[PDB]
């Protein structure tokens, strides 16, 4: 499930 936020 990929990162959907602006930062990692």
């Amino acid at each position: 499930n990929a990162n959907p936020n602006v930062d990692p």
Partner: antibody
Amino acid sequence: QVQLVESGGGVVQPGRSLRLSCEASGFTFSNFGMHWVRQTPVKGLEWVAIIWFDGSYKYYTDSVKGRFTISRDNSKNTLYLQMNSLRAEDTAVYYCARARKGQRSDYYGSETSYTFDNWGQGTLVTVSS
Amino acid sequence: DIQMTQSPSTLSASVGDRVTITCRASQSINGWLAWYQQKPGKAPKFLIYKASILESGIPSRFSGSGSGTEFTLTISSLQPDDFATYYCQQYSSYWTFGQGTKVEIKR
């Protein structure tokens, strides 16, 4: 404090439409992806949809494809769930939730996966004639 | 697609007891397993992630273990605030939940 507040729930006839809203406070709304999740007493918890922080990507659970649309208005700090062609089986409490890294914050690498936390109080959608 | 099954559906316990709840996945989810706590009329609250990492602010009496397809949530010494329903959630491929385990008061 981080707070999400859902609104827009109510009684809607089968085949009709309804738009849910989720207003965010206590954080930079446009920095986070967001989710909708729903709950029924018998069937339990079911993830509904996800949207990227800037609206640039989104996807849905199979049972709502072609009928629900997730969107956001970052100028209003608000998340939306447009629900068209509603069915009895869409009756549920609908929660919004903030995307969450399911790994230590300091870890950087391929072994990472995301989930969601900080759910709101929810809003009840009742599809009935 | 990945089905989560919790056991038991309802568990009775006393304040001070050690409680363990089981969660089983239909296929390997690595360690991408989260636990939530829910009180009646309230939203689920994030407790544990990565099978065993405690979320900040969650009391140390909560612990999680497991790998592959078998996971456990343990409360070392149950307190009155812990009577609630607990849900596991895999977040390896999309997001799916167990049916929940309700922890009730033994008598």
